[PDB]
Design a protein around this ligand. Structure first.
Ligand code: HEM
Length: 154
């Protein structure tokens, strides 16, 4: 789907994420919750966290951010050949809970924001476009897996 050069830009910046998965995951989740507070409602065990400092101090939130970015990184490294990885994630997101595709757009925005805030020298326009396409592909394929399970993602 993406070109080889696009995937290489995606994985180049992802290598920077891997130097500090926990910190990236905290900042991505906090940006998501700050920018779109309705998403915090989906996490019953994070609802009692009232400030950014409380969110940074929560080991539970930090652990979940690592779980999130580990799954995403594994998907990105498949360079689109990710059906076996996306199916369980769709089930996690469409069965136990109901995570609309729009919420995946919100977290994608937070991912772009944090990557550019931390790594501007390795996340210029071409890299941003590549990551945007990779996350678009992720969201499109997740949406199809949602429908397979009976969830329209709305
Ligand atoms: C890049 C996008 C995302 C990725 C890669 C991702 C990944 C994951 C993973 C790996 C799990 C654990 C699944 C398991 O082990 O059973 C999970 C659970 C969950 N996700 Fe996501 N997630 C993403 C976005 C979101 C968003 C945007 C929301 C809500 C607005 C959300 C809500 C949840 C909830 C509520 C759970 C259950 C966690 C719990 O039981 O405490 N996810 N996610």
């Amino acid at each position: 789907v993406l070109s080889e050069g696009e995937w290489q830009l995606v994985l180049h910046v992802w290598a920077k994420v891997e130097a500090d998965v926990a910190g990236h995951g905290q900042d991505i989740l906090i940006r998501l919750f700050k920018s779109h507070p309705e998403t915090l409602e989906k996490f019953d065990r994070f609802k009692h966290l009232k400030t950014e400092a409380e969110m940074k101090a929560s080991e539970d939130l930090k652990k979940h951010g690592v779980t999130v970015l580990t799954a995403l990184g594994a998907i990105l490294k498949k360079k689109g050949h990710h059906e076996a990885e996306l199916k369980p994630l769709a089930q996690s997101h469409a069965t136990k809970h109901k995570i609309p595709i729009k919420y995946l757009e919100f977290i994608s925005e937070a991912i772009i924001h944090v990557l550019h805030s931390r790594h501007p020298g390795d996340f210029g326009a071409d890299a941003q476009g590549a990551m945007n396409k990779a996350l678009e592909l992720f969201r499109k394929d997740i949406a199809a897996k949602y429908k397979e399970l009976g969830y329209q993602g709305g």
